Amino acid sequence: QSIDQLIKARGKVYFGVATDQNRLTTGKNAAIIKADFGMVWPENSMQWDATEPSQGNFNFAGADYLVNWAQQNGKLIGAGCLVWHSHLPSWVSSITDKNTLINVMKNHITTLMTRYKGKIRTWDVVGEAFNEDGSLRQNVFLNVIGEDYIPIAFQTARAADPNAKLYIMDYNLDSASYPKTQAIVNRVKQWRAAGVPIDGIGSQMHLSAGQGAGVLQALPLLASAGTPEVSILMLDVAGASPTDYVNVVNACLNVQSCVGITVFGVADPDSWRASSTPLLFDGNFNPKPAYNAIVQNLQQ
């Protein structure tokens, strides 16, 4: 039973998964994505270090493959991250002139979004912009440009492809009483009041066992920023307990602006934390108990 079909029947847009070329040609990933998921995201192939490893010299072979495959198989596409300290090649971090870095950032955003204009439902524009205490993270963009880099990034993205939904994403937004969760709400409200085109907040959700219950309170709090959409991104759950996964799905169903959920890969052995067996399919590509629990929850 397809969890994407079932979540669409409950009024949501998609159940998605991260993947890339060499996943689609190995294992049983392509068969499972075709049958059970409605949206694909490039795991790595759209990140800055993969797409612009030297200034102005773009690498699109891997991203092109994924976009083509998705179109051929009737899947939605999400993409990112346009601006994210974690995947930044060294040539960018060494820039010290404000105008140069603004131009570099704009060129990166505009080139990627133009190439796929009209084909991408959701773009993650800015990622991991916050410290755990809710202050802004001191990456090269904040240090050189200042806090205006976030408004500039979103304004540039909206002009490059007005059809795309534009998101800011971060992790550790999973507790309603954690400072980072209220801080991104505070800032996003302020930015949208200033006309910044932030369409969504994406929660990069890497949970430990038992943390699913708190998302029932955290996700409505993220929705109080007033963005048109919120999403769950890069989802995995240590231990893959049905209770944790069902709580995450119900948080999505409870929040009217939450459009869908993307899990961070298909099968456990291909996870960044495989020893925590945190995904919905096991190392033989069999659905795990959490997968069947989601199915039953969505049919209930």
Ligand SMILES: O=[N+]([O-])c1ccc2nn[nH]c2c1
């Ligand atoms: O939802 N995702 O799995 C996912 C993976 C990589 C990304 N880069 N930017 N946004 C992303 C979302």
